[PDB]
Amino acid sequence: TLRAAVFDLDGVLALPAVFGVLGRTEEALALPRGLLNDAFQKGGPEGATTRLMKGEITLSQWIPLMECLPKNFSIKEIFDKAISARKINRPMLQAALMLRKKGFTTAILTNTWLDDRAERDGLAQLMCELKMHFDFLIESCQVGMVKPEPQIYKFLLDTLKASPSEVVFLDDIGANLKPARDLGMVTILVQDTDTALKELEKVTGIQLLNTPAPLPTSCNPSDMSHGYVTVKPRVRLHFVELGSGPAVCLCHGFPESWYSWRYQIPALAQAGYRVLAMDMKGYGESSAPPEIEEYCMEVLCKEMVTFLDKLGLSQAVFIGHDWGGMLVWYMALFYPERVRAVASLNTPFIPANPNMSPLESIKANPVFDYQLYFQEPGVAEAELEQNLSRTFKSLFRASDESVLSMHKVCEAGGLFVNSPEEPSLSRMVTEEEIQFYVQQFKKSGFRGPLNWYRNMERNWKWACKSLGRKILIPALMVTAEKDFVLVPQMSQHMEDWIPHLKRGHIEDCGHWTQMDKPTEVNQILIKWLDSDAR
Amino acid sequence: TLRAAVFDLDGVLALPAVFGVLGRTEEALALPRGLLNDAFQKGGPEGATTRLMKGEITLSQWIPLMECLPKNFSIKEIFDKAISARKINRPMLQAALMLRKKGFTTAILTNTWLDDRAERDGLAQLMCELKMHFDFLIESCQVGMVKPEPQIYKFLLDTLKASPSEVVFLDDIGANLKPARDLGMVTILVQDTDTALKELEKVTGIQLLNTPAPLPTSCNPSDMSHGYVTVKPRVRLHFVELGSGPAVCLCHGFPESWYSWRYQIPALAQAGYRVLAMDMKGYGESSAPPEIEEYCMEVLCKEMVTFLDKLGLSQAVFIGHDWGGMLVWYMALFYPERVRAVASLNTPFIPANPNMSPLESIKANPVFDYQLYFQEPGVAEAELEQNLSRTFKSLFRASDESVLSMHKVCEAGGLFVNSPEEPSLSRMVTEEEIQFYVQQFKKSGFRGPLNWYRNMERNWKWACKSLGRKILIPALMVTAEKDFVLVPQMSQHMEDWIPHLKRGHIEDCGHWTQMDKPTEVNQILIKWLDSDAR
Ligand SMILES: OC1(c2cc(-c3ccccc3)[nH]n2)CCCC1
Ligand SMILES: OC1(c2cc(-c3ccccc3)[nH]n2)CCCC1
């Protein structure tokens, strides 16, 4: 019985193989077969390459291997092209990801070097992306041992804390497979990925090939960088930070958390962006003052500006969902100099009606009756705080899983009057994911979050000041087909106020866009960021 | 008697003035005098410009002002050049900085616009740099009021919480000065900065002109973004983060804090870098496990790699001082792919002697006898923790202020045997700055920090593995003339191991480089970052 899987980097987790080059260089440059790729191996265990793979010398020290050849011949150039062409073998990583999800201890065992080239970042980025998905990364140059030497396999077994018979070992080199096999490990010679995965599938008894498209990488709260900024005495804002590049500020809706962006955080960071996933004022680890006025759009926007000020950021791309989407449009209208680009999921931009009170506007639409239920302080707090597990299980559901109506809420006397005491677990969320929201809401409750709805008149007066303005900065509107509150049609006239507005649309998607359709959200956002936000 | 100072942005805190352009455009393009600059003012209070300055419309909406002129004529281009040429009037900001340090309430009052141009970041950066140095920033487009209207001055007075006679008002426009003067405020017509400062000097009774060069901007701990990363169960690393751009990781020495970089943090962020000022393992808000082995170079370096991994950073420029400088050279030798560039202040790179034990090496040099005193667990902790204020006041001193010898420490039985109970406050530190270090050291004490010295044999064995390597990545060595422990001569042979090594040297500088000579440190580091780290 097996509980561990070991993968080689080159020719297994990363394709094309490092030595696929050479074979290609010799052929292309019409050089004698094997000359290059044998001069590279010169001296064997006492040679320059073994010293490099053991970490005795760096790649730049090794470049002068050194060793008729033409004028336009460079080992540096051949190796730069080879390392840069090498991309993650996605089906292989997907299989490793599946085995780990199924309880396996996963590891990368590779014959690698200490890269000190000017272009070393390319490989550093690749290793950073791969290493996060595995329990261990064993590099020859770090341990001072190499494949095929028997010592590295005994080291591998020690790190895994497993007997040889409990381990699968995948490698593209037969010589490096042999010591694993002779110790009693299950081995796979990797030629084409498909047959290697068929062999891995048969041995583990787990479906790896032709499996449904997996969900994007999520976040483990304890493995994140948590940031804290005091925006004013007694008001501190919490955020989760990941990646380098242009700052992308993610703003959640009601009754959410930074965790609502769990599928977007790794994806956007990987796309070349510095992600700042907020816990909005009144939520999670951010401060939750009791006063209603502390949650009016003007104060919330001013505090987001202070957040940028204190972090030393002149600009950030503002991506919002729900109430976050609303704030995000107001950041673009009142502080365009601080907004690099603006994007909203579900929340349209509707200019304020100066001739109609917001209470008149809300009463005119029956979908918005829950907003009137949210007006009286204490009422909705009591219902929502009564049973936190019930609250999140009832709300966080796909379009087909609906349990709550949202209509006639005030007349019925609550959101959960037609709802079960023990709602079933939605396909979008795990029990553990629900419990995270439960734990975050135990700190401050629903007073702060609900206060976002208690400034209708205040927000209306402030928004009326921007009635003569137009949003001329890069903007994106993402509509969700099955959002029965924030309907795609509500966005129809936005081009009148945002002429250069770009659009995205997600079919079979409910209100909880980020967790309902994570892959589609990431795809739309990355495409727009790369084209409009740099 | 005065306690408040108000400055205009244009033609006062920022030069050249916005309208210096036009006068220059008309002249250069041989257009009728005033045509441009009057068509701009068309309609007066009901005109397009007043609507813009009140925040009714954006700058891009205003561009089509609109209004024989040539083919190669563009208001967008004229305004882009004008805004980009405008730089901070450093002597004016320096004067504002002096008044605020002397107890004054400072404010910026400006007739400005909502900038939504593609090049809006330039101005956003300028405002971000200026606003941090003032109590208030009053923008016409945010308040819906403009200069010269009497309402903005009553608003100014309200925000300042001061009577007119307590306020100095500086402006380059006579019309906008008049309402402040007629209310009873002291006013200054700003033409040339020197006479304006002479007038400001006479009225306040504070020296503003020809004052000694001020210290760089420092950090107020409560105004910083504090980050926290768990590198392994029970080990969390704390850092202060400021700025955008390439990640610059600052590593302090013994017995320091992230705060030792207080003068570098704002400067490097302003230079276009993302500063991550660490609380090294065993210090401040970072975890301090008791075990000695937790502080060996191999573990500390591995944890710094995990820190980059969890933050989603493939690379960071590593700048270290003292023990931080040592770690930083080992990051370059063992993880070159994760180090964009490497810089050390005072700490030279000396390869390990494989034929001599580190205890033999330490005994051979009498300057290093304190390291032998630091060996026995509990001994140095007791002396250093006895009186924290005394510990920091005795250590943090300039080359001329020496109170401790560091020689014959073991024979004398301590670092402070020749030291006073109440040492005088060094010129480098304030009482408040000393108290910050006192408060940070109250959490974990000196066990963790001292354990950095308790791995001599372990560190020696690990360093011996890198003896065949060379540092080929961008590197900088900064020597301090009067550091009597980390002498500039100790660095003499570094070119043998780091061939492309760049150098910096600071005269009349002791061991505490960052606080001794902050201006010179910032200048050397920024110059090197911009040339070698991108
Ligand atoms: O959070 C809900 C919600 C979301 C909004 C909203 C308010 C303003 C703008 C956008 C959305 N209002 N209400 C969805 C589930 C139950 C209430
Ligand atoms: O912190 C001190 C110190 C600094 C170092 C050091 C150790 C290793 C490398 C560089 C410096 N060893 N000791 C300076 C004041 C009292 C001790």
Swiss-Prot record, chains A, B:
<dbReference type="GO" id="GO:0042803">
    <property type="term" value="F:protein homodimerization activity"/>
</dbReference>
<keyword id="KW-0479">Metal-binding</keyword>
<keyword id="KW-0460">Magnesium</keyword>
<feature type="binding site">
    <location>
        <position position="8"/>
    </location>
    <ligand>
        <name>Mg(2+)</name>
    </ligand>
</feature>
<keyword id="KW-0443">Lipid metabolism</keyword>
<comment type="function">
    <text>Bifunctional enzyme. The N-terminal domain has lipid phosphatase activity, with the highest activity towards threo-9,10-phosphonooxy-hydroxy-octadecanoic acid, followed by erythro-9,10-phosphonooxy-hydroxy-octadecanoic acid, 12-phosphonooxy-octadec-9Z-enoic acid and 12-phosphonooxy-octadec-9E-enoic acid. Has phosphatase activity toward lyso-glycerophospholipids with also some lower activity toward lysolipids of sphingolipid and isoprenoid phosphates.</text>
</comment>
<dbReference type="GO" id="GO:0005777">
    <property type="term" value="C:peroxisome"/>
</dbReference>
<comment type="function">
    <text>Bifunctional enzyme. The C-terminal domain has epoxide hydrolase activity and acts on epoxides (alkene oxides, oxiranes) and arene oxides. Plays a role in xenobiotic metabolism by degrading potentially toxic epoxides. Also determines steady-state levels of physiological mediators.</text>
</comment>
<dbReference type="InterPro" id="IPR036412">
    <property type="entry name" value="HAD-like_sf"/>
</dbReference>
<dbReference type="Pfam" id="PF00561">
    <property type="entry name" value="Abhydrolase_1"/>
</dbReference>
<dbReference type="GO" id="GO:0004301">
    <property type="term" value="F:epoxide hydrolase activity"/>
</dbReference>
<feature type="active site" description="Proton acceptor">
    <location>
        <position position="511"/>
    </location>
</feature>
<dbReference type="GO" id="GO:0042577">
    <property type="term" value="F:lipid phosphatase activity"/>
</dbReference>
<dbReference type="GO" id="GO:0016791">
    <property type="term" value="F:phosphatase activity"/>
</dbReference>
<dbReference type="InterPro" id="IPR023214">
    <property type="entry name" value="HAD_sf"/>
</dbReference>
<dbReference type="Pfam" id="PF00702">
    <property type="entry name" value="Hydrolase"/>
</dbReference>
<keyword id="KW-0007">Acetylation</keyword>
<feature type="modified residue" description="Phosphoserine">
    <location>
        <position position="357"/>
    </location>
</feature>
<dbReference type="GO" id="GO:0033885">
    <property type="term" value="F:10-hydroxy-9-(phosphonooxy)octadecanoate phosphatase activity"/>
</dbReference>
<comment type="similarity">
    <text>Belongs to the AB hydrolase superfamily. Epoxide hydrolase family.</text>
</comment>
<dbReference type="InterPro" id="IPR029058">
    <property type="entry name" value="AB_hydrolase_fold"/>
</dbReference>
<feature type="binding site">
    <location>
        <position position="370"/>
    </location>
    <ligand>
        <name>substrate</name>
    </ligand>
</feature>
<dbReference type="GO" id="GO:0005782">
    <property type="term" value="C:peroxisomal matrix"/>
</dbReference>
<feature type="modified residue" description="N6-acetyllysine">
    <location>
        <position position="202"/>
    </location>
</feature>
<dbReference type="GO" id="GO:0015643">
    <property type="term" value="F:toxic substance binding"/>
</dbReference>
<dbReference type="InterPro" id="IPR023198">
    <property type="entry name" value="PGP-like_dom2"/>
</dbReference>
<dbReference type="GO" id="GO:0010628">
    <property type="term" value="P:positive regulation of gene expression"/>
</dbReference>
<keyword id="KW-0597">Phosphoprotein</keyword>
<dbReference type="InterPro" id="IPR006439">
    <property type="entry name" value="HAD-SF_hydro_IA"/>
</dbReference>
<dbReference type="InterPro" id="IPR000073">
    <property type="entry name" value="AB_hydrolase_1"/>
</dbReference>
<dbReference type="GO" id="GO:0001558">
    <property type="term" value="P:regulation of cell growth"/>
</dbReference>
<dbReference type="GO" id="GO:0005829">
    <property type="term" value="C:cytosol"/>
</dbReference>
<dbReference type="GO" id="GO:0097176">
    <property type="term" value="P:epoxide metabolic process"/>
</dbReference>
<dbReference type="GO" id="GO:0052642">
    <property type="term" value="F:lysophosphatidic acid phosphatase activity"/>
</dbReference>
<feature type="lipid moiety-binding region" description="S-(15-deoxy-Delta12,14-prostaglandin J2-9-yl)cysteine">
    <location>
        <position position="509"/>
    </location>
</feature>
<comment type="subunit">
    <text>Homodimer.</text>
</comment>
<dbReference type="GO" id="GO:0070062">
    <property type="term" value="C:extracellular exosome"/>
</dbReference>
<dbReference type="GO" id="GO:0046839">
    <property type="term" value="P:phospholipid dephosphorylation"/>
</dbReference>
<dbReference type="GO" id="GO:0009636">
    <property type="term" value="P:response to toxic substance"/>
</dbReference>
<feature type="modified residue" description="N6-acetyllysine">
    <location>
        <position position="178"/>
    </location>
</feature>
<feature type="modified residue" description="N6-succinyllysine">
    <location>
        <position position="442"/>
    </location>
</feature>
<feature type="modified residue" description="N6-succinyllysine">
    <location>
        <position position="408"/>
    </location>
</feature>
